[PDB]
């Protein structure tokens, strides 16, 4: 094929990254994120990225989807920051919530320069790294969740 003559000729470029970095500047949830070691959590609520209060971190509604940014010091330099970004998809989350959580994970990755490593965490399938984020007893699944942002077409 002729990629260069095609509609994918500008994929993979610095220009693509630049445009997406700019878009990520328009989400208030990312301001201040990833500035120190710890865990930050947001829940998708009718398409919006909404902070979860620290006192609830580790409790997740089975009906909902979340973004969890774990900031830590890498082995290479104890004074710098690295990132794992997990998106957690409840067993009963709706398609709008999971799709928004996926897209906004990519956006937070863009905001942080690509550095976050992404992990998709479906309820019951959480990775070893996700299980290691919460202290003993800290990971709890709650019944229910917030309403879908979709309008149902009858």
């Amino acid at each position: 094929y002729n990629i260069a003559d095609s509609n994918i000729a500008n994929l993979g470029t610095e220009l693509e990254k630049k445009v997406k970095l700019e878009a990520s500047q328009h989400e208030d949830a990312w301001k201040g994120a990833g500035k120190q070691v710890g865990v930050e959590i947001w829940r998708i609520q009718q398409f919006k990225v909404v902070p979860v209060p620290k006192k609830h971190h580790g409790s997740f509604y089975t009906g909902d989807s979340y973004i969890v940014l774990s900031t830590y010091h890498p082995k290479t330099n104890p004074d710098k920051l690295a990132y794992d970004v997990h998106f957690w998809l409840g067993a009963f989350t709706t398609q709008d919530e999971a799709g928004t959580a996926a897209y906004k994970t990519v956006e937070l990755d863009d905001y942080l320069g690509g550095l976050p490593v992404q992990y998709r965490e479906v309820q019951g399938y959480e990775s070893e790294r996700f299980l290691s984020l919460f202290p003993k007893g800290g990971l709890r699944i709650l019944d229910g969740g917030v309403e879908t942002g979709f309008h149902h077409v009858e």
Binding site: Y1, I3, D5, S6, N7, I8, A9, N10, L11, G12, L15, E16, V19, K20, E22, A23, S24, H26, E27, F47, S65, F87, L89, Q95, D96, A98, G99, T100, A101, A102, Y103, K104, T105, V106, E107, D109, Q118, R120, T148, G149, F150, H151, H152, V153
Partner: protein, 362 residues
């Protein structure tokens, strides 16, 4: 302000409003004119096909009749959705590996003829992946044209590994028309192509083992099904049920030397960096109407298993709503203010012209 989402397939328009869970208008991407030598569009053309010749302005994802495509878009806005397009930011979609001029002209028409306030052209497979709740995976999208494979890692499509096959549902319909002649049936005209399309969608399936299935079909009538035609005649079909979609796996059935959809999926994965291949093999997402044949996911599982390393964990994801996954992913993304921030505005188009689409839409 509500954005419109329009997934212009080769075969079907899927159109509606961002934030809805499904497209509110789904209709054939066709313009009909009198078969006896002014025009009709979509469902109404299909209804009166008895006296019309039907033409698809899109073939293999590429607009080949711009005047008729403008009729389709006008009908979508004014007659189906009943909206004024100058009031709605609009998300359109496209197959990958199209010539750049296709989206330049889409952009020009949307701004200069329909006066949309803003617009974006998205790659279909990327929308499907987000609809599935993933940022990494490999999408196999097959509609009425252009089967494509798009591997995506951390939300970015990997352009060097994208594959395209200009073999999809329309080619399968045409092949079913051809092989039904062996039974003595004659399906030839554009209206008859639409009947055969319906037979295909209702009765075809992918055999798990093609040669075994051929032998089963000769041993007894156990695989036969009947179908009532619009004139009331009842026909019978047998091994055509599975020979038709077998073409996806054996493109030589229609004289193409191409790799089939299993081997192309595998080849796309093998063009990606080795360390991400396990995640692609475990996340093969199917989208589009031509992935709806019963048996296709199991046949894909079998065929990719045969090509891949013997310990590779392989999973085919086949969402039940996958006829609409591209549209749904668009509905989700177009509900996000940061996604809309990237859209081309009317003022940007006025100042930059069609070239701007390649600098904003990824």
């Amino acid at each position: 302000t509500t954005a419109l989402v329009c997934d212009n397939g080769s075969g079907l328009v899927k159109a509606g409003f961002a934030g809805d869970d499904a497209p509110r208008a789904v209709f054939p991407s066709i313009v009909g004119r009198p078969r006896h030598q002014d025009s009709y569009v979509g469902d109404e053309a299909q209804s009166k096909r008895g006296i019309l010749t039907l033409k698809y302005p899109i073939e293999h994802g590429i607009i080949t009749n711009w005047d008729d495509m403008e009729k389709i878009w006008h009908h979508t806005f004014y007659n189906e959705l009943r909206v004024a397009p100058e009031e709605h930011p609009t998300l359109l979609t496209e197959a990958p590996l199209n010539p750049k001029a296709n989206r330049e002209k889409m952009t020009q028409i949307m701004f200069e003829t329909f006066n949309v306030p803003a617009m974006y052209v998205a790659i279909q497979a990327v929308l499907s992946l987000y609809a599935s709740g993933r940022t990494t995976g490999i999408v196999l999208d097959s509609g009425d044209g252009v089967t494509h494979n798009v591997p995506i890692y951390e939300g970015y499509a990997l352009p060097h590994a994208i594959m395209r096959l200009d073999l999809a549902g329309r080619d399968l319909t045409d092949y079913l028309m051809k092989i039904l002649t062996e039974r003595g049936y004659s399906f030839v005209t554009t209206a008859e192509r639409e009947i055969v399309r319906d037979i295909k969608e209702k009765l075809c399936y992918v055999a798990l083992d093609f040669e075994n299935e051929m032998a089963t079909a000769a041993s007894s009538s156990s695989l036969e099904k009947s179908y009532e035609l619009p004139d009331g005649q009842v026909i019978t079909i047998g091994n055509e049920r599975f020979r038709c979609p077998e073409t996806l796996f054996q493109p030589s059935f229609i004289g193409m030397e191409s790799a089939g959809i299993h081997e192309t999926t595998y080849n796309s994965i093998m063009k990606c960096d080795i360390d991400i291949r396990k995640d692609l093999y475990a996340n093969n997402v199917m989208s589009g109407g031509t992935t709806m044949y019963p048996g296709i996911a199991d046949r894909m599982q079998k065929e990719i298993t045969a090509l891949a390393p013997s310990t590779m964990k392989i999973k085919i994801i086949a969402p039940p709503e996958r006829k609409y996954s591209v549209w749904i992913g668009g509905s989700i993304l177009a509900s996000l203010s940061t996604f809309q921030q990237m859209w081309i505005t009317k003022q940007e188009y006025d100042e930059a012209g069609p070239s701007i689409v390649h600098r904003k839409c990824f």
